[PDB]
């Protein structure tokens, strides 16, 4: 009867389509799944209000972010500006 959908449509980590069961936070454009939203280093749960780093492959937290960057190649000097960073937004609801 009624179908409320306003998300992207498909994942960017898996191959599962997006439905009223994502429970993810507002990312750049591609909205992942609750299980698809994991760190690439510690694989821990994210927090709403903190910062995070989005990689071309997966996402990274703000705990090992400084390590992962130097591991890959994104150092901006000791105490210097290396790159941008986004703050974890609020999660989406299935109707509200």
């Amino acid at each position: 009867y009624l179908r409320l959908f306003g998300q992207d449509g498909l994942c960017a980590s898996c191959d599962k389509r997006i439905r009223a069961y994502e429970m993810t936070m507002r990312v750049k454009d591609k909205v992942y799944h609750l299980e698809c939203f994991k760190c690439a280093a510690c694989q821990k749960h994210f927090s709403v209000g903190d910062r995070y780093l989005l990689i071309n492959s997966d996402i990274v937290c703000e705990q090992d972010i400084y390590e992962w960057t130097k591991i890959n190649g994104g150092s901006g000097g000791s105490g210097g500006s290396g790159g941008d960073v986004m703050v974890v937004g609020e999660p989406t609801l299935m109707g509200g």
Binding site: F46, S47, G49, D50, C61, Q63
Partner: protein, 39 residues
């Protein structure tokens, strides 16, 4: 892990209580600022 409580440090907390100043509190120590009235 994520941020830690300013009183305990429950990283496994279901939700983080963050105010305007940025006083990260789990929930247990978080209600201390509300009920007791302390910071």
């Amino acid at each position: 892990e994520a941020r830690e409580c300013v009183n305990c440090g429950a990283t496994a907390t279901p939700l983080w209580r963050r105010d305007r100043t940025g006083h990260y509190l789990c929930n247990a120590c978080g209600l201390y600022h509300k009920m007791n009235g302390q910071n």
